[PDB]
Design a protein around this motif. Structure first.
Motif, PDB file in Angstrom:
ATOM      1  N   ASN A 194      51.012  41.321  96.287  1.00 27.59           N
ATOM      2  CA  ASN A 194      51.560  41.323  97.641  1.00 27.59           C
ATOM      3  C   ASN A 194      50.532  41.863  98.635  1.00 27.59           C
ATOM      4  O   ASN A 194      50.861  42.626  99.549  1.00 27.59           O
ATOM      5  CB  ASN A 194      52.867  42.116  97.712  1.00 27.59           C
ATOM      6  CG  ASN A 194      54.001  41.458  96.932  1.00 27.59           C
ATOM      7  OD1 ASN A 194      54.212  40.248  97.015  1.00 27.59           O
ATOM      8  ND2 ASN A 194      54.742  42.262  96.177  1.00 27.59           N
ATOM      9  N   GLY A 195      49.264  41.489  98.453  1.00 23.64           N
ATOM     10  CA  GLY A 195      48.204  42.012  99.291  1.00 23.64           C
ATOM     11  C   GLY A 195      48.320  41.558 100.733  1.00 23.64           C
ATOM     12  O   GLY A 195      49.010  40.594 101.064  1.00 23.64           O
ATOM     13  N   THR A 196      47.630  42.283 101.617  1.00 24.04           N
ATOM     14  CA  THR A 196      47.697  42.041 103.053  1.00 24.04           C
ATOM     15  C   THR A 196      46.492  41.272 103.589  1.00 24.04           C
ATOM     16  O   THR A 196      46.464  40.942 104.779  1.00 24.04           O
ATOM     17  CB  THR A 196      47.827  43.377 103.798  1.00 24.04           C
ATOM     18  OG1 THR A 196      48.602  44.289 103.012  1.00 24.04           O
ATOM     19  CG2 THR A 196      48.522  43.179 105.134  1.00 24.04           C
ATOM     20  N   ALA A 198      44.064  38.368 104.717  1.00 18.04           N
ATOM     21  CA  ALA A 198      44.393  37.069 105.300  1.00 18.04           C
ATOM     22  C   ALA A 198      44.114  35.927 104.329  1.00 18.04           C
ATOM     23  O   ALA A 198      44.914  34.992 104.217  1.00 18.04           O
ATOM     24  CB  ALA A 198      43.619  36.864 106.603  1.00 18.04           C
ATOM     25  N   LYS A 199      42.969  35.973 103.637  1.00 14.78           N
ATOM     26  CA  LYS A 199      42.642  34.926 102.670  1.00 14.78           C
ATOM     27  C   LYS A 199      43.676  34.859 101.551  1.00 14.78           C
ATOM     28  O   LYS A 199      43.994  33.774 101.051  1.00 14.78           O
ATOM     29  CB  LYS A 199      41.247  35.153 102.088  1.00 14.78           C
ATOM     30  CG  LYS A 199      40.274  35.820 103.034  1.00 14.78           C
ATOM     31  CD  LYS A 199      38.965  35.056 103.077  1.00 14.78           C
ATOM     32  CE  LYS A 199      37.855  35.901 103.676  1.00 14.78           C
ATOM     33  NZ  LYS A 199      38.226  36.464 105.005  1.00 14.78           N
ATOM     34  N   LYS A 218      46.907  35.573 101.799  1.00 12.20           N
ATOM     35  CA  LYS A 218      48.079  34.893 102.348  1.00 12.20           C
ATOM     36  C   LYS A 218      47.905  33.381 102.322  1.00 12.20           C
ATOM     37  O   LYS A 218      48.850  32.643 102.018  1.00 12.20           O
ATOM     38  CB  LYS A 218      48.350  35.369 103.775  1.00 12.20           C
ATOM     39  CG  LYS A 218      49.498  34.637 104.452  1.00 12.20           C
ATOM     40  CD  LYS A 218      49.573  34.960 105.932  1.00 12.20           C
ATOM     41  CE  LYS A 218      50.655  34.140 106.616  1.00 12.20           C
ATOM     42  NZ  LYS A 218      50.702  34.406 108.079  1.00 12.20           N
ATOM     43  N   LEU A 219      46.699  32.900 102.635  1.00  8.65           N
ATOM     44  CA  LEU A 219      46.452  31.462 102.608  1.00  8.65           C
ATOM     45  C   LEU A 219      46.560  30.913 101.193  1.00  8.65           C
ATOM     46  O   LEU A 219      47.121  29.834 100.979  1.00  8.65           O
ATOM     47  CB  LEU A 219      45.079  31.150 103.197  1.00  8.65           C
ATOM     48  CG  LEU A 219      44.881  31.634 104.631  1.00  8.65           C
ATOM     49  CD1 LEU A 219      43.465  31.337 105.089  1.00  8.65           C
ATOM     50  CD2 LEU A 219      45.919  31.018 105.564  1.00  8.65           C
ATOM     51  N   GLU A 233      49.479  28.407  99.957  1.00 10.13           N
ATOM     52  CA  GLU A 233      48.960  27.204  99.309  1.00 10.13           C
ATOM     53  C   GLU A 233      49.459  27.102  97.876  1.00 10.13           C
ATOM     54  O   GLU A 233      49.725  26.002  97.377  1.00 10.13           O
ATOM     55  CB  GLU A 233      47.432  27.191  99.338  1.00 10.13           C
ATOM     56  CG  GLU A 233      46.794  25.842  98.985  1.00 10.13           C
ATOM     57  CD  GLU A 233      47.114  24.738  99.978  1.00 10.13           C
ATOM     58  OE1 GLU A 233      47.333  25.053 101.168  1.00 10.13           O
ATOM     59  OE2 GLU A 233      47.131  23.553  99.570  1.00 10.13           O
ATOM     60  N   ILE A 243      40.265  38.440  97.503  1.00  5.18           N
ATOM     61  CA  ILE A 243      39.468  37.221  97.543  1.00  5.18           C
ATOM     62  C   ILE A 243      38.376  37.419  98.583  1.00  5.18           C
ATOM     63  O   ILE A 243      38.678  37.713  99.745  1.00  5.18           O
ATOM     64  CB  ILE A 243      40.306  35.974  97.862  1.00  5.18           C
ATOM     65  CG1 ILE A 243      41.116  35.572  96.637  1.00  5.18           C
ATOM     66  CG2 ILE A 243      39.398  34.825  98.273  1.00  5.18           C
ATOM     67  CD1 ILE A 243      41.739  34.212  96.755  1.00  5.18           C
TER      68      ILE A 243
END
Lengths: 213, 221, 216, 128, 215, 222, 212, 221
Positions: free
Chosen positions: C6-8, C10-11, C13-14, C18, C111
């Protein structure tokens, strides 16, 4: 109380060389709220970079900003002629803006000795009851120099004010005019009026003097 | 084409109040930020206050919060500033600029529009014309010039032979005398072979006093 | 299924959203389970239907997965006794399980290079476009798109197809027509493998003289 | 189904409204591409069908969205289970009609089949 | 093998300033396998950063790690109150983990002089054959201070033990307790028990003393 | 819902063997990593060994390679550690944690789950209750307390008037004497104007021996 | 006209440690046009890194370059055996390339004392009228050493030539041969020939000498 | 496959002119960059000039503008270099290489192809074989060798008993004597206990003169 510092106060470098300007704050500022502006003599400020590493629209790519926390640095990769000016960094926090004192950029100029001349008060000027003696140092470098007045070898202080020209766009030199203000009484009390010129470009101090006429 | 236009030069006596406007053309006030920054002659820049059209909020620097007021008219797209209880330390040039920093998660945005500057001179002296005295020559290259002493207020303009002389011309910035009046010099280097031939006349125009003087400088003994 | 991280970043989240497109796409497919009056009436895709139905037999998926362990293209003889051509077109299982699940299985995942996200999008898009085609045609599409089969894949099939030498040259020179006369039949999806049958036309009679009659 | 007004006006429009704008993390750009892509494909579908498309694509309405409709639809429980197990058929018997677009809102109506007759014995007749 | 060092050992700073903590290893480590952890007193370690410059889930964005090869730096851009604790950096190679000695973070406090008191052993304790004399330096700062024992002006060493308080959350000061160990026999051999207190907050040492029998 | 549960506090004499458990609940053992790390009193952290469920391989530090053993029970979701030849330098607090870092081309991943810690005390002394001695106060602001000397083992709890006193209280951590018994102090800063009126009684409770003594504090009483 | 400097000139470090090589230019250089190349003895240069932080095809990831304007740094993260060689940085501007003097990389070896030998010229050479005396320092470390000649304790200069071996691949030691050239006339004028050797491995200089 | 082929080693006397080729195979010249860089014996690297097939322009270093010429034959995929007024400071090894940096907005590109190198030695001496003199031994570790003095030009070969001895073998690079001839030494460490048994003969072959001499090293007393 946000306090800003910039180093150096005056930087002299040659065109085509890299200029590195520092900006340090008394406390941490948000990087988004930091900005850099450039001011030329007689102009309103121009915004160069903001948020550390973001150039404004139409600003050449040779300008680049960086920094974080308390220390920020504006770097110019290859100085252009139109870059020689004053550079202020601008902090802001809670929409409370705070300006640094500014770093002046100078042409690194080959050391040059000033041509020294002295001007007695005009005979028309004594007819007004006031005497102003003028001494000129034209086309010298660097800017730092000293001019001392001596009337019959008696040193005078507190009665002289000096004005400095900006660096002329062609020769990259400075000029200075020392205007000594005395009353007609103190003027006509002595014979020899001397203007002592000392400067980096001079191996020895140069003194120009004249008598009563 | 966005342009900012400030009020004309103003002169006010100590203790008085000064008003400066900043008119916006080609853009609306409600979507821009407008701040006031002043510059004392030869010193750094100093923030005073500002206006944020995005939020309709006014900001003051704590140094002037007790004696400065800022008003924004959205209907005229004009911002005014007013500083009272003026002292000789308030003599400076005043600018309006867009320092507003917009912050989102996606990025940042900012405007960069400025006025032309407004000269404000504060002093107890009244309007007075200048006196012009010639500075006459007597190693291999000689210099001559004119002294413009005892006038008020700024500014003055100086040319040479109606604009005919540019090479070697160095016009010096004014200094403020203890009498409250300004004094300055303007010189030029000329060949010593032209001491006898060419006439050198300095053209000085002091606009506040409507005094225009062309003064001949001649070499002597 | 379950994403642990559940990391914050931005990459991340993508990659997450996806990856959810992948989980959603699979879930969609699992849910699926003048004188013309004188003409005859036959079900053309009865052949493809029988094949996709045979796939529901247990172990049949494995014999494919077995035959295609080493290579991408292989011939498989089915339990009924017919020989059919099978091929792997994209390997997402290996990318996801070997490069993503061990990272995301953990509390804090990171990532760095964003190119990894783009490379993931590139491989994953072909599946999503295949899912889109099937969901609007109830698992039977015609013609067969480059999403379902690129020309490199289709020509690789024609050369390996059990057809005559003359037919190979014919089909190859007119691939765009065969696409229009082909059906892509969605079959099954189980045992961490997805399979779908493609019904290909074979032209048994060629070069006899044709003539067209216009009347008014 | 989608809020672009909130993202654009609250995260981008204030930036672009200014003279000099900056974009730092490039991931911001991709997230915008993702959100905006659905709008572009829906617009393309309508421009080739004059606002009347059939069947209803996943671009027009995801399966998660459609079942939220079918579950909330004023239909019988049997109708719910019928449509849900065969949603791809419902798509084929549905029309997506473009309606209006004004006041910072885009809207389009979706015509859904509702099956009033279910489970009666059917038979197919072949003749030759 | 892999040896880690951290500089400084103890860092004293005010909230809102930038804290920079150094970690250096005896050899090169892979950036992916280096990590940073935090420990507060009485708690298990907390994971802050891993893989050099990668923050864990739920850790505030003001924390940032960087580095490569042999020199690594954990930066805290604006210290928060709950950041004051012990910070260990962790190396690993081929699943062989190795911890540094840790950099502790301390409150920057205005220098304060301790309130000095000395305690005779209770008469109930003398009945046991052992005497424990106590000298207290309560609420002082900075951390550095010295306590020397003198019994009838005779210096005592090796028979005293010192305990350190945690930095009190309110005054940001420390306190220390020196416990002098004597038997009752060795106790009643001398008269004056003196405790010389030296500390930064005192321009000159302040000494509190008592004789044998003063009640 | 990952949770780590360790065995209760243990006390073992030199040369013995100690077993500490680390139970995993709400999560599988075979796909996670579990490492044992200890902290000597007042010193840094020291790695000992670990288990990597991703590969099912055990790693030990060369310092303890000869006398430390690690066991993983996949069926009970429980990890044990077993150390023999216990010495006085091993007395510390011991934790189990997930330091395993999984590395692929796409990025990194790691867990951060810990047990509650299990204090293991190694000494030749037997369980014994504490002794309480009064520390009497006297300039304008006075300090008073109680001396808690000679007990074993940790821990003991110290309050003042059954938790009624919080202002000015500084309770010192215990130190281990060469005699094998612990000793600690607990003080409080109060105005000397309260010397005559308010009664100060220190409450000490040593749970392993259940020995509780309430000692009254007087300024002089002479 | 672009002048480059490198520091250090010679770097001696052990495998597995981090190598940091500096390149500094007299003026600003274009970042795209800066490069670092590696040369081993007897080989043409091989291009490793270009544009500071851009690796060439087939170069191991242990190599990394960085820098801008006037200061550039080539870093090797973990030295490999075939990395011990000479490293030159290369600037270019308007297709005007300029090479630095190069930093040579040496194996860090534990200090070793030289084996000292001296060899008189054979009598067969004296029949030609010329005498060449050889003094040998075999298998020593580091490279920096001094060899001084003394003929009847008189220092000789300008008549000596020294040859240096490359670092031997196995023992990581050096060897040196100082060749002193004299005529037959001046050779047979003196008795004792001494070779003065001072080096890190010697606590005191060791001299080998012989009579005529 | 791409391959670079240079002309053979050349020897030219001072003041003469030398032409060196650099042939490209398996690739066209018009798409490559070709630069000439030389290496003085034991000294640093020096750029000389180059050719950019993309632009068909030749560039020279100011140090060599007056006496260096470069020719490119596009039809033979061959590059030549031509240097006159050769001096003893020009004795060096010369390589052709591809240093060309192509720059676009998208990124960078560069080649890495080199020839084998061409040694050019300039001197007024003619090819001559060396004279070989023994370096004879006389505690626990002994040294012996052979002196190869007065020859020209490079190279010479030294083995010991036709390659049977490798341990302790140190063959030194040649040195240029003031006489214009090269000189070198080659030694090997052997046990002093083996002085009486094993015969030590150094095998020298100087190819420019085709002179081969095998010299035994014996103890002398």
């Amino acid at each position: 109380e946000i306090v800003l510092t910039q180093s150096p106060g005056t930087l002299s470098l040659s065109p085509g060389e890299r200029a590195t300007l520092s900006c340090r704050a008394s406390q941490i500022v948000s990087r988004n709220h930091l900005a850099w502006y450039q001011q030329k003599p007689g102009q309103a400020p121009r915004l160069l970079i903001f948020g550390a590493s973001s150039r404004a629209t139409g600003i050449p790519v040779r300008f680049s900003g960086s920094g974080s926390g308390t220390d920020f640095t504006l770097t110019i990769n290859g100085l252009a002629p139109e870059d020689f000016a004053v550079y202020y960094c601008l902090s802001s926090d809670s929409s409370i803006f705070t300006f640094g004192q500014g770093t002046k950029v100078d042409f690194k100029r080959t050391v040059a000795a000033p041509s020294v001349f002295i001007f007695p008060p005009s005979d028309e000027q004594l007819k007004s009851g006031t005497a102003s003696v003028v001494c000129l140092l034209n086309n010298f470098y660097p800017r730092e120099a000293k001019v001392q007045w001596k009337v019959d070898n008696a040193l005078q202080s507190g009665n002289s004010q000096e004005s400095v020209t900006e660096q002329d766009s062609k020769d990259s030199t400075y000029s200075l005019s020392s205007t000594l203000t005395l009353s007609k009484a103190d003027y006509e009390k002595h014979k020899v009026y001397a203007c002592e010129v000392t400067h980096q470009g001079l191996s020895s101090p140069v003194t120009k003097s004249f008598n009563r006429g | 084409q966005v342009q900012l236009v400030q009020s004309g030069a103003e002169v006010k006596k100590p203790g008085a109040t000064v008003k400066v406007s900043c008119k916006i053309s080609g853009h609306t006030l409600i979507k821009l930020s407008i701040h006031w920054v002043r510059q004392a002659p030869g010193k750094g820049l100093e923030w005073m206050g500002g206006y944020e059209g995005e939020v309709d909020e006014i900001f003051y620097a704590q140094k002037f919060q007790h004696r400065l007021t800022v008003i924004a008219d959205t209907a005229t797209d004009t911002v005014y500033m007013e500083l009272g209880r003026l002292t000789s330390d308030d003599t400076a040039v005043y600018f309006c600029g867009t320092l507003g920093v917009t912050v989102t998660e996606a990025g940042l945005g900012i405007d960069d529009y400025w006025g032309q500057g407004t000269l404000v001179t504060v002093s107890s002296a009244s309007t007075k014309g200048p006196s012009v005295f010639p500075l006459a020559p007597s190693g291999g290259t000689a210099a001559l010039g004119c002294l413009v002493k005892d006038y008020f207020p700024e500014p003055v303009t100086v040319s040479w032979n109606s604009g005919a002389l540019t090479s070697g011309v160095h016009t010096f910035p004014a200094v403020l005398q203890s009498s409250g009046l300004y004094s300055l010099s303007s010189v030029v280097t000329v060949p010593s072979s032209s001491l006898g031939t060419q006439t050198y006349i300095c053209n000085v125009n002091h606009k506040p006093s409507n005094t225009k003087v062309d003064k001949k400088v001649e070499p002597k003994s | 299924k379950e994403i642990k991280c559940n990391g914050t970043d931005a990459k991340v989240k993508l990659i997450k959203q996806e990856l959810d497109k992948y989980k959603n796409a699979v879930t969609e497919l699992q849910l699926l389970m003048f004188l013309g009056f004188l003409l005859g009436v036959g079900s053309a895709i009865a052949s493809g239907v029988a094949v996709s139905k045979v796939l529901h037999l247990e172990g049949e998926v494995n014999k494919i997965k077995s035959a295609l362990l080493s290579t991408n293209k292989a011939v498989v003889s089915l339990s009924n006794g017919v020989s059919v051509l099978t091929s792997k077109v994209l390997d997402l299982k290996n990318y996801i399980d070997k490069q993503l699940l061990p990272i995301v299985n953990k509390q804090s995942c990171s990532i760095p290079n964003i190119e990894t996200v783009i490379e993931f999008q590139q491989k994953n898009n072909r599946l999503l476009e295949i899912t889109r085609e099937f969901s609007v045609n109830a698992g039977v599409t015609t013609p067969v798109s480059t999403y379902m089969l690129t020309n490199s894949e289709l020509l690789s099939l024609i050369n390996d197809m059990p057809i005559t030498n003359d037919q190979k040259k014919l089909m190859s020179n007119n691939v765009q027509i065969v696409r229009q006369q082909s059906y892509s039949i969605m079959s099954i999806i189980k045992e961490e493998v997805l399979a779908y049958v493609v019904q290909l036309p074979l032209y048994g009679v060629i070069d006899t003289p044709c003539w067209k009659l216009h009347t008014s």
